[PDB]
Write an enzyme that holds these catalytic residues in place. Structure first.
Site, mmCIF file in Angstrom:
data_model
loop_
_atom_site.group_PDB
_atom_site.id
_atom_site.type_symbol
_atom_site.label_atom_id
_atom_site.label_comp_id
_atom_site.label_asym_id
_atom_site.label_seq_id
_atom_site.Cartn_x
_atom_site.Cartn_y
_atom_site.Cartn_z
ATOM 1 N N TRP A 148 42.446 33.495 18.190
ATOM 2 C CA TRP A 148 42.177 32.921 16.955
ATOM 3 C C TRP A 148 42.333 31.514 16.855
ATOM 4 O O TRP A 148 41.918 30.953 15.846
ATOM 5 C CB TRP A 148 42.681 33.979 15.779
ATOM 6 C CG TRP A 148 44.127 33.549 15.574
ATOM 7 C CD1 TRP A 148 45.166 33.533 16.079
ATOM 8 C CD2 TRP A 148 44.671 33.799 14.083
ATOM 9 N NE1 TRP A 148 46.469 33.311 15.554
ATOM 10 C CE2 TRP A 148 46.009 33.471 14.056
ATOM 11 C CE3 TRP A 148 44.006 33.845 12.745
ATOM 12 C CZ2 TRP A 148 46.854 33.108 12.997
ATOM 13 C CZ3 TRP A 148 44.654 33.648 11.615
ATOM 14 C CH2 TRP A 148 46.183 33.393 11.610
ATOM 15 N N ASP A 149 43.470 31.004 17.301
ATOM 16 C CA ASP A 149 43.753 29.627 17.427
ATOM 17 C C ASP A 149 42.229 28.603 17.486
ATOM 18 O O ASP A 149 42.346 27.626 16.855
ATOM 19 C CB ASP A 149 44.497 29.300 18.491
ATOM 20 C CG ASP A 149 45.790 29.852 18.615
ATOM 21 O OD1 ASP A 149 46.576 29.268 19.224
ATOM 22 O OD2 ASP A 149 46.071 31.199 18.516
ATOM 23 N N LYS B 189 57.144 34.229 10.477
ATOM 24 C CA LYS B 189 56.860 33.420 11.546
ATOM 25 C C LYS B 189 56.051 32.060 11.252
ATOM 26 O O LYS B 189 56.074 30.931 11.709
ATOM 27 C CB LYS B 189 56.315 33.942 12.755
ATOM 28 C CG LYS B 189 56.163 33.388 14.053
ATOM 29 C CD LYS B 189 55.265 34.425 15.220
ATOM 30 C CE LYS B 189 55.644 33.725 16.406
ATOM 31 N NZ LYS B 189 54.819 34.261 17.565
ATOM 32 N N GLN B 190 55.208 32.592 10.369
ATOM 33 C CA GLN B 190 54.065 31.561 10.055
ATOM 34 C C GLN B 190 53.420 31.975 8.760
ATOM 35 O O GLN B 190 53.438 33.186 8.401
ATOM 36 C CB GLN B 190 52.967 31.340 11.258
ATOM 37 C CG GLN B 190 52.187 32.833 11.685
ATOM 38 C CD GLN B 190 51.870 32.771 13.104
ATOM 39 O OE1 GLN B 190 52.479 33.109 14.166
ATOM 40 N NE2 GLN B 190 50.795 32.560 13.168
ATOM 41 N N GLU C 24 53.784 37.512 13.107
ATOM 42 C CA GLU C 24 53.861 38.457 14.521
ATOM 43 C C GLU C 24 55.338 39.093 14.050
ATOM 44 O O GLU C 24 55.745 40.013 15.017
ATOM 45 C CB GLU C 24 53.591 38.011 15.489
ATOM 46 C CG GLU C 24 52.035 37.728 15.773
ATOM 47 C CD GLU C 24 51.605 37.319 17.263
ATOM 48 O OE1 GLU C 24 50.382 37.158 17.481
ATOM 49 O OE2 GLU C 24 52.680 36.542 17.947
HETATM 50 O O1 LIG Z 1 50.677 36.501 25.283
HETATM 51 C C1 LIG Z 1 51.491 37.600 24.907
HETATM 52 C C2 LIG Z 1 51.677 37.529 23.419
HETATM 53 O O2 LIG Z 1 52.706 36.356 23.450
HETATM 54 C C3 LIG Z 1 53.397 36.082 22.165
HETATM 55 O O3 LIG Z 1 54.194 34.875 22.364
HETATM 56 C C4 LIG Z 1 52.417 35.638 21.223
HETATM 57 O O4 LIG Z 1 53.249 35.358 20.065
HETATM 58 C C5 LIG Z 1 51.217 36.792 21.000
HETATM 59 O O5 LIG Z 1 50.470 36.357 19.853
HETATM 60 C C6 LIG Z 1 50.674 36.942 22.539
HETATM 61 O O6 LIG Z 1 49.685 37.964 22.760
HETATM 62 O O1 LIG Z 2 49.139 30.107 20.257
HETATM 63 C C1 LIG Z 2 48.693 31.596 20.627
HETATM 64 C C2 LIG Z 2 49.580 32.626 19.654
HETATM 65 O O2 LIG Z 2 51.058 32.276 19.710
HETATM 66 C C3 LIG Z 2 51.677 33.069 18.820
HETATM 67 O O3 LIG Z 2 53.027 32.657 18.813
HETATM 68 C C4 LIG Z 2 51.284 32.966 17.298
HETATM 69 O O4 LIG Z 2 52.248 33.755 16.593
HETATM 70 C C5 LIG Z 2 49.738 33.574 17.372
HETATM 71 O O5 LIG Z 2 49.298 33.352 15.870
HETATM 72 C C6 LIG Z 2 49.220 32.642 18.165
HETATM 73 O O6 LIG Z 2 47.763 32.992 18.139
#
Ligand SMILES: OC[C@H]1O[C@@H](O)[C@H](O)[C@@H](O)[C@@H]1O
Ligand SMILES: OC[C@H]1O[C@@H](O)[C@H](O)[C@@H](O)[C@@H]1O
Ligand SMILES: OC[C@H]1O[C@@H](O)[C@H](O)[C@@H](O)[C@@H]1O
Ligand SMILES: OC[C@H]1O[C@@H](O)[C@H](O)[C@@H](O)[C@@H]1O
EC number: 2.4.1.230
Lengths: 756, 756
Positions: free
Chosen positions: B343-344, B596-597, B483
């Site tokens: 989604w970024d 977290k955000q 998250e």
């Molecule tokens: O890549 C595995 C997961 O790593 C975590 O650091 C992120 O917060 C998730 O958004 C991601 O799916």
């Molecule tokens: O940057 C990729 C992913 O990182 C994670 O830490 C975030 O919590 C997610 O929103 C993000 O999509």
């Protein structure tokens, strides 16, 4: 395992990559050699993994001793982060070669940026009795923390030769196979010329109180690096015992068929013994060898230690079982000179083995015997007869001297030693007689030695050129032992040795005919000997020219050497080595009387029973002062001969120049490998110099020792005619004891004949 | 080449290995990416060489963007010894990224242990217009010596992924072939799952006064490394020019045919162009990009410069010609998150493109369109309907989120984002509308976009659950944008966005039937859309539960959240990032109100035209105090909404956090790659926060700017309905000019209609 006392220990100061220590801490059993790199294999380290006789050319200028994949690698990860020694605060560092036990030990106590403290303590050896085997054992202790530890073992088959020189780098092997075989990991190679196959099997285990203590093993195929990895849920203060056994097998071995099968079965057998028990078998071999070879100097702890070091590498690098190899100019310790065999071995190294382990010396002579056909072919290709041994020998016995390199100033230059440094063929004949004189090995002489001596004499009879006006034979356009002067005529050393080789062959022919007629016949039929040849050899020898000024008693190194510009040697460097005289152009060395190493003096050492005391003294004084000591071969012979001619002013310092060649890196290139000839030279200078042993015309063992100031005593043992003798030399006296009562030994101790 | 002025330069202070600067100086053209290592490739460096869309799994847990062979390596040798900059005295060092010309420049003046001084000066770029080409150009001057220089170009195919983690390390390619083709060197790989082939052709030359000046070229095959070498008799003071061109081709391109032939043909054409022609093309592309995307901030140099950095990396990484890749979470700048698209991209990054180069936005959205079959299969197999887009996407469009990882304490954990972070599929449907509304790209909407939006509505219809008791639809057991909280019920963000997606979809179906019924017919048949579905969506959407807690006006993040333990965020580190409150355990984040955000505050930004100013304030105030900013996506959304609620000191504060994410490395892990979302965030904070822009119903462009205290002036441009509008905000006044006219524009400046 407990370290030996300090007397037997050689210490590195600081944790770091070091060319010098990689050479000094190189471990070998005469088959496998491994450079003293750190187990992590740091950034700037030069690994060296060799098996004796495994040579390859590929795209290199000449054949080279192959740098095989590096198998000893071991790293520790804390929660998947590499525990990198050079990245920690170092709380404790010890690193020593234990010369008595033949192990390289290292202990680290490390503090990482997290403030975690870890201990890594252990050792490794290249098994003297299990020639295929390398053994590594390391205890790891997480002192103030708990974590998942990954013990990573790896074989690195990205190694190459001449790693630091872009022009010369070549990979001499291809990877045939890589395998996780559950009990370990395997990588197999074929040299690029396809002449050799090598298998490498390695098996690592991690134990706590002798149980396997890892929750997971995995392996990784990373291209030409394969890894074995053990994850351990490590608890604070617990003692994690890491053992790694590695087996190397080559297609040189009788007779193996599949290196993979042989490796993995060999490893099974080794798995049924403990690390402790492989070690004890290893230490027994060193006991047996040290029992004869150890020399005790009292009053000079530097000399005593440095001498154990010289001897240890000598005793480590020979394998009497292998009659198809010999010792390269840098042992099995590095790549300098490409693992080639020179006169270093016959003349500098061999006497050590003749007098301390005669079976090793015989094997190295059998190397030359077995390459006789290549030496005959080499003769024929240069227009000569008999056997012309190459200046540089590898596996086939063809001339492997490079034709091109770079001079003192970095410029490209032709290399002429392969072409015209002929004395090698005489040096090998001399070394044959030297071995037979010492051991009375008549079987060897009759079946192998005589043929070598006669074929090299045939070569000398072909190259000597009769000058009619002068009524003399000459040998022109040569290099003698002093490599600074090229395209010389009548190098005295060469002419004299050729003359010696010719008379030796005649003498042998008449002895075999009179006393061993069935052997004479078989030799004569094998090599087509005619009745006239003995006479032809006597005739050439009687008239070979030796340049010599009777009025001055001076032997001229080669014709016209006396007209060349003289020069004073005015200073020594931090290592007490000669520094070039002001005025000298390093690419005009041919125009001066400055010399690299012993040349006339070498002659006076080897054939000394044939010159008078005044001569030896006069020529010693003239040349010693013009000698730059620009080869590691040089100082030993000037220490030894200094003593023999009462010119002892500088005997000690030349002695310490040879003894410290690699420990003080006094030629500046210790990183290329051990200066193997200088090890033999050191031993010779003690025994044939300070110990005062000399052999006289009737093979009577004379003894006229001289100890330097600092030494109260010198003890050493030699084999002489099958009798093991113990010598004890003090300021005032000399005692000689037989280790077995029985047999008779005739000695001349300071002008006085003595029976023991 | 001449360097841009300092305002456009990002400087490294010191010659060294640096993960931070490997990321910061990574160069890309949206096809190739190259990490900012030094030419020499020092021991601690982490090469990265990537091609967009080139993914492999092999033994790894999930598919990963492949780290290909490193082709940029270049080393100098002086008389055969490596001129190692880390072993020299550094008399002069400069290394900058030029943001304006997109080149990486370095100059060294080195003094070696032999006293020789050498200058090495040059730069490199990854061609913006020639997408296969890497250009390298260096000058070398031997300032006080002459010698033979060897210039060594190397392609190093010993590279792997996850190099410093033993468990995870994976080589994702095999070497197919190596070749010296006389005008260069070639190496080709195929990935281990065999899905991609890549050819690398490189040509180096060394010139003095534009004439080839080397006396010898040679190449070496060293296993999985190939080298191209040039020997130069270099004279003191002469300026030797090294030029290296590298072509990378993948089977993702059309009509590659034989890879060797394609690579070497392309390089042959490039070789007809001078480096200065090549560089001028390259700069012209950046010029075109910056002409629209540059943002001019006056009154704050730190913010103006870090902003250039953020936009530089955005403009570098999108290739609008490629409809089968999109932007990974770390661009093509590192291995962090394995190149996966999240989604970024649609929510954070995509707006930047939509408004500065819509063609790039559209290609990114076509990536999704082309992956709809995979999204349908993902739904199907999870027991759902329509299109369930994966949380992490790579090449095939299957779910690539790892199921296992390591928590904040280093222990193994289940990762639940792939399973239950559902909101991605609404995020994509949002991005589609966002793009369409800005551009009026009706054709995209009819042929592509509507299918996406309707299939994600079908998903949302199929996951909603009717609570018969409480009378509503629910989406239970989810992870929302925050998250920290797993297995939540009725995350407001997710429920509103699903409600938005369902209603948007009905609306579109009504528009399509009536205004474009042929298109509605074609799509309806394609996807088997029955007449009843849109009524079902409207009905589900009317009954979806939104946790209002009135008339506190407080949107609860998810149901039960308000009951969790509250903590005061009190402390910050020296980059001004929140530190965890005392009494928080990092394995128990589910039991606390710390987030977290942005989650609810994320919802108030995206669907802002649906909540009142009082509501926004309240929720912004409540949630910001609780926000840990433990994702680099967090700060920009709080800056933006902060400004929108007049809470304004904290806005500048959050803004500098997202501006400086990588240049100050504020999350501590910049070495993994660029924080690509935060780049877009930064841009959006500027345009939609401080800049004052929002879109209110009926596509009225509204403008209510609030500049920070420091800021005198903010300039920028955006494309709106095909018009390029230049905006100039000062503390008092706003102006707007069309640079390109197209659509009619409905503009309001502070409540007031305006004209342009
Ligand atoms: O890549 C595995 C997961 O790593 C975590 O650091 C992120 O917060 C998730 O958004 C991601 O799916
Ligand atoms: O940057 C990729 C992913 O990182 C994670 O830490 C975030 O919590 C997610 O929103 C993000 O999509
Ligand atoms: O290996 C090539 C040559 O190198 C020189 O450094 C040695 O002095 C020679 O004896 C040898 O033949
Ligand atoms: O050690 C190999 C060779 O090195 C040269 O430096 C010496 O002059 C030779 O006599 C020697 O045999």
């Amino acid at each position: 395992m407990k370290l030996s006392e300090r007397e037997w220990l050689i210490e590195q100061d600081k944790l770091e990559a070091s060319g010098k220590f990689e050479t000094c801490f190189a471990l070998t059993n005469g088959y496998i050699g491994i450079r003293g790199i750190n187990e992590e294999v740091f950034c700037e380290e030069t690994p060296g993994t060799y098996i004796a006789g495994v040579f390859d050319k590929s795209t290199a200028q000449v054949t080279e001793l192959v740098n095989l994949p590096n198998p000893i690698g071991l790293r520790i990860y804390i929660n998947r982060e590499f525990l990198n020694p050079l990245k920690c605060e170092i709380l404790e560092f010890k690193r020593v070669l234990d010369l008595k036990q033949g192990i390289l030990y290292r202990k680290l106590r490390l503090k990482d940026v997290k403030g975690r403290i870890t201990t890594i303590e252990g050792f490794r050896f290249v098994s003297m009795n299990n020639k295929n085997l390398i053994v590594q054992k390391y205890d790891v202790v997480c002192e103030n923390y708990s974590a998942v530890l990954n013990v990573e073992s790896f074989i690195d088959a990205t190694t190459v030769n001449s790693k630091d020189v872009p022009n010369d780098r070549v990979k001499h092997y291809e990877i045939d196979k890589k395998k996780d075989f559950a009990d370990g990991i395997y990588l197999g190679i074929t040299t690029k010329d396809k002449k050799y196959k090598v298998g490498i099997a390695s098996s690592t285990k991690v134990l706590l109180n002798n149980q396997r203590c890892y929750f997971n093993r995995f392996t990784k195929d990373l291209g030409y690096i394969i890894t074995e990895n053990f994850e351990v849920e490590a608890k604070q203060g617990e003692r994690y015992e890491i053992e790694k056994l590695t087996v190397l097998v080559s297609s040189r071995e009788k007779n193996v068929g599949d290196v993979f099968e042989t490796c993995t079965n060999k490893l099974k057998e080794f798995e049924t013994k403990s690390a402790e028990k492989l070690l004890f078998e290893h230490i027994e071999e060193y006991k047996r060898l040290w029992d004869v070879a150890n020399i005790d100097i009292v009053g000079d702890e530097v000399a005593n230690k440095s001498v154990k070091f010289n001897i240890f590498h000598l005793i480590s690098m020979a394998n009497p079982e292998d009659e198809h190899v010999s010792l390269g100019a840098k042992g099995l310790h590095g790549e300098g000179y490409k693992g080639h065999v020179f006169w270093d071995t016959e003349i500098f190294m061999l006497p050590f083995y003749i007098y301390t382990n005669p079976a090793a010396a015989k094997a190295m002579l059998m190397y030359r015997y077995n390459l006789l056909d290549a030496a005959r072919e080499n003769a024929r290709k240069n227009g000569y007869k008999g056997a012309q041994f190459p200046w540089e020998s590898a596996d086939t016995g063809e001339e492997e001297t490079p034709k091109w390199g770079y001079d003192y100033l970095g410029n490209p230059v032709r290399i002429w030693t392969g072409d015209i440094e002929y004395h090698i063929s005489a040096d090998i004949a001399y070394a044959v007689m030297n071995y037979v004189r010492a051991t009375d090995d008549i079987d060897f002489l009759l079946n192998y030695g005589s043929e070598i001596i006669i074929e090299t004499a045939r070569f000398w009879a072909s190259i000597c050129k009769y000058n009619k006006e002068k009524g003399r034979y000459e040998i022109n356009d040569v290099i003698g032992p002093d490599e600074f002067h090229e395209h010389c005529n009548n190098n005295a050393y060469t002419n004299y040795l050729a003359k010696w080789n010719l008379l030796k062959a005649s003498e042998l022919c008449n002895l075999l005919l009179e006393k061993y007629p069935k052997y004479f016949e078989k030799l004569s039929k094998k090599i087509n000997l005619s009745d006239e040849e003995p006479f032809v050899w006597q005739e050439i020898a009687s008239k070979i020219y030796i340049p010599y000024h009777p009025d001055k008693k001076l032997i001229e190194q080669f014709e016209g050497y006396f007209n060349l510009k003289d020069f004073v040697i005015k200073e020594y460097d931090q290592n007490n080595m000669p520094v070039w005289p002001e005025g000298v152009e390093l690419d005009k060395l041919n125009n001066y009387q400055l010399i690299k190493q012993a040349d006339v003096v070498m002659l006076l050492y080897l054939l000394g029973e044939e010159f008078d005391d005044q001569t030896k003294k006069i020529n010693y004084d003239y040349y010693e002062k013009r000698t730059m000591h620009k080869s590691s071969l040089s100082p030993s012979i000037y220490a030894l001969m200094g003593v023999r001619v009462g010119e002892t002013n500088r005997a000690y310092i030349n002695f310490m120049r040879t003894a410290l060649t690699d420990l003080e890196d006094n030629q500046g290139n210790t990183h290329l490998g051990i200066h193997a000839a200088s090890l033999g030279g050191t031993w010779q200078a003690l025994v044939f110099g300070f110990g005062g042993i000399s052999i006289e015309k009737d093979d009577v063992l004379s003894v006229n020792p001289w100890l330097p100031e600092k030494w109260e005593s010198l003890k050493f043992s030699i084999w002489w005619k099958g009798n093991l003798l113990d010598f004890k030399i003090t300021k005032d006296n000399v005692e000689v004891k037989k280790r077995v009562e029985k047999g008779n030994v005739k000695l001349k101790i300071k002008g006085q004949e003595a029976i023991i």
